[PDB]
């Protein structure tokens, strides 16, 4: 558990439907939600592969479970009952435990993605912005739409607003 | 100028079970269990079953006179809970269950 | 008149899902029978409105 979902970001966004993780920006030109295309796409692909691995790895053969035994073969019938119940027990335990573990893995995967996104933005901004606590950064300079889409792409330009941020600090 | 980092939420009510806590509301969840059936005895591998309505396999293979109402191939046999018409003359059918196993599917 | 891959006395199962809880007696390529009632795999994240 990496302390993001329910951690330092205590809420989710319902107006954000284009992705799973992303940004909410407020500048002079406006405010809005935008998804992180790369992280969302990677997460979608990984979860799709996960579901397909859980489902399709199960191989089956043509089986005819169920046999008929007359009264003088109560031992073979009991053996068949034993075979059936053992398989049922094994498969029940395996299915329940696999789902229980895999749900954990998925939730921590999402938490990790949110935390990593936050870390990336933070290491891009350095001291040109400040961390207010709820997952937001207040810019010491003026970041317009171009600067914001630069942040949401990995192409921030710290030695372009370094002087303005130093003056406003 | 503010840039917040966050995640997606929705008004979903599907819960999942987790090894550490139960009833966790998630945004989406798939089903790995099937609980529904169409309620029909349909064909297997493109071949229809052999339906013995009031007969069992013994009566059908022996020629009970109440079995003349009833395929060159089949994938499985279907007997009804009321299929009581079998060996009309009393006696014992030797290796009956072996015969039923062999007759289960014929090309 | 159907085409199905898994048959049970009550009816046919047509799915790619690996587990089922309709009947232990099955004919064909069938999902494994489990005594579970709810096997849901979490796909999205934790909903915290």
């Amino acid at each position, epitope marked *: 558990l990496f302390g993001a979902i329910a951690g330092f970001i205590e809420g989710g966004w319902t*107006g954000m439907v284009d992705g799973w993780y992303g940004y909410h920006h407020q500048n002079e030109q406006g405010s809005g939600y935008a998804a992180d295309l790369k992280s969302t796409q990677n997460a979608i692909d990984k979860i799709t592969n996960k579901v397909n691995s859980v489902i399709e790895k199960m191989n089956t053969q043509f089986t005819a479970v169920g046999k008929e035994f007359n009264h003088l073969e109560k031992r073979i019938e009991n053996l068949n009952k034993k075979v059936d119940d053992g398989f049922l027990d094994i498969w029940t335990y395996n299915a329940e435990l696999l789902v229980l573990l895999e749900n954990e893995r998925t939730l921590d995967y999402h938490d990790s993605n949110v935390k990593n996104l936050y870390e990336k933005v933070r290491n891009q901004l350095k001291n040109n912005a400040k961390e207010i606590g709820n997952g937001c950064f207040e810019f010491y300079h003026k970041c317009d739409n171009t600067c914001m889409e630069s942040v949401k792409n990995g192409t921030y330009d710290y030695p372009k607003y370094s002087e303005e941020a130093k003056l406003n600090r | 100028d503010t840039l917040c980092i966050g995640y997606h939420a*929705n008004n979903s009510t599907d819960t999942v079970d987790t090894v550490l806590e139960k009833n966790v509301t998630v945004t989406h969840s798939v089903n790995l269990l099937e609980d529904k059936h169409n309620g029909k005895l349909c064909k297997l591998r493109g071949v229809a079953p052999l339906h013995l309505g009031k007969c069992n396999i013994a009566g059908w293979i022996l020629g009970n006179p109440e079995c003349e109402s009833l395929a060159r191939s089949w994938s499985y046999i279907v007997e009804t809970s009321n299929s009581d018409n079998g060996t009309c003359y009393p006696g014992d059918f030797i290796n009956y269950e072996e015969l039923r196993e062999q007759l289960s599917s014929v090309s | 008149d159907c085409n199905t891959t898994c048959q049970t006395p009550e009816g046919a199962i047509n799915t790619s899902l690996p587990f089922q809880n309709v009947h232990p007696i099955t004919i064909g390529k069938c999902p494994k029978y489990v005594k579970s009632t709810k096997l849901r795999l979490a796909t999205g994240l934790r909903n915290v409105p």
Partner: antibody
Amino acid sequence: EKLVESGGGLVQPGGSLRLSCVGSGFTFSNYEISWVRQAPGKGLEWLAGDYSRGGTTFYADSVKGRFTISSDNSQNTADLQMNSLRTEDTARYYCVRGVSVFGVLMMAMDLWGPGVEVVVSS
Amino acid sequence: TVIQEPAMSVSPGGTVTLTCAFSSGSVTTSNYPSWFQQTPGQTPRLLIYRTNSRPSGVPTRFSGAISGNKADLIITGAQANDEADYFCNLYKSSDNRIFGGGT
């Protein structure tokens, strides 16, 4: 795979009208159902969208407070109810479906219905 | 609002680009531009979504890109079946999904 709409006709201004869209060949669970209107001569206008599995409903600023969209996945239907209809609401209405994988919309309005004409002349 | 060219024409076998822009902002991949085709009197058809993706039935000659703060739909080698109205849908917000004027 098709979407069929019904419920069009003539309604006096200030009235209410209900349109229904039924889908065949797929399940409404894994899709978002939206309503798009096309006025004569003008272009398309997106009105409302409903993701029933996620329980999310979205409305355009032009029809907010008047229109209401509901969905029933069991019966595979989507209903749009229009109130306080104005003269500028006359158009051909389409029930469109949009792809949603794992609860996330991908803005892919792949399948459209033929549409139903609505005239709000007095 | 969304600005589109009101009418453009091409010669058969040639190439053409259709441009969709914002009235006041910039068009980004985060806006998920989509391109629809509508023969008059028929239901609209999804040609392109997310600026680079085509459904399983759209001909290969249709392509999409983002150039110069605008969304572009490129038709290479147009037949006579391409005489239709082309619409651009730009996603601005959950409640705001703007269709273009048409071409």
